Amino acid sequence: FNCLGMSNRDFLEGVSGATWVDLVLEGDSCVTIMSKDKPTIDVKMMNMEAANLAEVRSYCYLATVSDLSTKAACPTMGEAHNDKRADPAFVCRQGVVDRGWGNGCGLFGKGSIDTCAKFACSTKAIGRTILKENIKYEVAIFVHGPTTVESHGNYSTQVGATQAGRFSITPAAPSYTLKLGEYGEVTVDCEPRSGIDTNAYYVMTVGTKTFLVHREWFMDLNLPWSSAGSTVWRNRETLMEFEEPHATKQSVIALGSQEGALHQALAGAIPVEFSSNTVKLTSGHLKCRVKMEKLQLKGTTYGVCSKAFKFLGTPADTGHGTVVLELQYTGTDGPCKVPISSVASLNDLTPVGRLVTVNPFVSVATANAKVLIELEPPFGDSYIVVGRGEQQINHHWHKS
């Protein structure tokens, strides 16, 4: 929900004197944004899903091909009408059988025949739609306020500290104004627009493995089917019945169910994880405008920390041209600003390393508190320093 530690991170400084910034978020990526005299924040897209879906069709693979019927009609006696023709209880089909004396009929020749088999469904290869209106985005915003190696990744702690949030964006309401306590608030206006595949594709569901198929390959396929009712049409797939029998019994062999027909057209349609009501879309992006003239600093009326500061370990390389590290404050005094900067050479007057964790400070008054810090040092060798004079400590670093 925040950027630290992610490989898909991008640092931004909107514009000069800008209270807003235009941005682009995508799947597994994050973005850290900096702005003069204001907290740093991380905008990050968490999830992409198609919610509130609706079914469209339902092809079956089937069972019930058990009950039989064979309404017999003697030659010249006309056609045969099976009572099992009043209700879709069964599927009927007429035929004719060569007969006569040999089998109870008076004349010789073709006699009518109208048998019927039953139909209900077993495994429904269900499928649904994705209204562009069903697309909802989940953006998470973090605030680079006080943290520790520990609490930095705990969403809970952070929310509690009002230094994080997770809201959703929809075509309905593409914006939001996330309030962050005394830090004011950030208001994004993400524009659902994105470079992705049009809703044109259907939502194919097969047993467990969900897939995304082409409207037509799907709709224009050959298998029994049913929209939103218990009523099924084209059940003709109850085939291979017409052994072209006798009036006694017309073998109604249940058509062998060969999942190959489906499977075979696997690769074509893209696979997708789908929970009863959700469809996580993987490909997609979002253009946002992080307006933040309402984002504001905090603890700016406090004094500078004046007590020893100790490193808790070799700073680490984020792989982004910045490093992380955690301090510990011997200080007994309360919430004070942390005097840390990046100096080009011991005891220089002017800094050179910009802090990602701008305006850092010991959150509590409980001595020996920890402070996490991410900063970008200059290239080549440099020194990180905390405190000043004879309290001041330091640790060297060399960027490449």
Ligand X SMILES: *[C@H]1O[C@H](CO[C@H]2O[C@@H](C)[C@@H](O)[C@@H](O)[C@@H]2O)[C@@H](O[C@H]2O[C@H](CO)[C@@H](O)[C@H](O)[C@H]2NC(C)=O)[C@H](O)[C@H]1NC(C)=O
Q: Give the one residue of 123, 129, 157, 170 binding ligand X; rule: CB under 6 A.
A: 157
Q: Is 154 in the site for ligand X (CB under 6 A)?
A: yes
Contacts of 264 (CB under 8 A, 6+ apart): none
Q: Is 208 in the site for ligand X (CB under 6 A)?
A: no
Cβ(370)–Cβ(148) below 8 Å: yes
Cβ(62)–Cβ(224) below 8 Å: yes
Q: Is 156 in the site for ligand X (CB under 6 A)?
A: yes
Residue number closest to ligand X, CB atom: 154
Part in contact with ligand X (CB under 6 A); list of ranges 12-20, 150-158, 276-284, 384-392: 150-158
For residue 261, the surrounding DSSP H or E stretch is helix 260-263
Angle (nearest 5°) at CA 22 between 16 and 25: 135
Q: Least distance to ligand X from the beta carbon of 390, Å? A: 33
Part in contact with ligand X (CB under 6 A); list of ranges 89-97, 112-120, 151-159, 321-329: 151-159
Q: What are phi and psi of 157, to 5 degrees?
A: -40, -55
Q: Is 16 in the site for ligand X (CB under 6 A)?
A: no
Q: Least distance to ligand X from the beta carbon of 154, Å? A: 3
Starting at the earlier edge strand, list the strands of the sheet with 340-343. 340-343, 380-386, 393-399
CA-based nearest residue to 39, from 144, 166, 140, 142: 144
Q: Which of residues 37-76 bind ligand X (CB under 6 A)?
A: none
Number of residues that bind ligand X (CB under 6 A): 3
Query: Is 97 or 324 the residue whose CB approaches ligand X more closely?
Result: 324
How far is C-alpha 288 from the geometric centre of its chain's CA atoms? Answer: 18
Query: Is 146 or 377 the residue whose CB approaches ligand X more closely?
Result: 146
Helices in 87-239 by DSSP H: which ranges?
A: 155-160, 215-219
Q: Least distance to ligand X from the beta carbon of 150, Å? A: 6
The CA–CA distances, whole Å, from 276 to 51, 54, 103, 204, 210 equal: 10, 11, 57, 13, 11
Part in contact with ligand X (CB under 6 A); list of ranges 86-94, 154-162, 281-289, 348-356: 154-162
Site string for ligand X, 77-116 (x = CB under 6 A): ----------------------------------------
Q: Least distance to ligand X from the beta carbon of 163, Å? A: 12
How far is it, in rounded angstroms, from Cα 141 to Cα 166?
6
Q: Footprint of ligand X on this chain (CB under 6 A)?
A: 154, 156-157
